[PDB]
Amino acid sequence: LSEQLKHCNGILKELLSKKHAAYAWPFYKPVDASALGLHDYHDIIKHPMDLSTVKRKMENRDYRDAQEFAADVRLMFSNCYKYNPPDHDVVAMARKLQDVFEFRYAKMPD
Numbered sequence: 001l002s003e004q005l006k007h008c009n010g011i012l013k014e015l016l017s018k019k020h021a022a023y024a025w026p027f028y029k030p031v032d033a034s035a036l037g038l039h040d041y042h043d044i045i046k047h048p049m050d051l052s053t054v055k056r057k058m059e060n061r062d063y064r065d066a067q068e069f070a071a072d073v074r075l076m077f078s079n080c081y082k083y084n085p086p087d088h089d090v091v092a093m094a095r096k097l098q099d100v101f102e103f104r105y106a107k108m109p110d
């Protein structure tokens with residue numbers, strides 16, 4: 001990995017760590033729309049994203065730069081904010097995990 005992609009991998013490990021598990025866990029795996037009874041999910045969300053998919057892409061060297069990695073993490077949060085009413089518990093959890101992400105992403109080495 002490039003230096004910037006090492007920083008991204010560190011962020012990814014933190015987002016998956018026990019430290020943040022209380023609010024990160026809904027983002028660990030793809031939304032199982034059928035299992036959750038969310039039969040409109042794939043009509044509303046055209047590009048699903050989750051941390052297991054970001055991890056697989058990082059492991060496969062899919063991300064060529066930090067910007068491409070960040071676009072997937074933000075897509076994951078944006079999907080949550082698009083699908084769910086803003087007062088829902090899962091949106092509160094998204095906001096908290098995105099705060100962890102944005103503050104550490106901002107510490108990117110130049």
Ligand SMILES: COCc1nc2cnc3cc(-c4c(C)noc4C)c(OC[C@H]4CCNC4)cc3c2n1[C@H](C)c1ccccc1
Binds near residue numbers: 027084
């Ligand atoms: C113990 O609870 C069972 C349970 N397992 C899971 C697994 N993944 C979930 C993913 C989402 C989710 C995200 C993220 N972004 O968009 C969605 C939609 C999730 O969203 C809550 C919606 C379900 C019904 N409308 C709101 C829930 C997930 C989930 N859950 C439950 C249902 C849950 C509920 C509230 C907060 C977190 C998890």
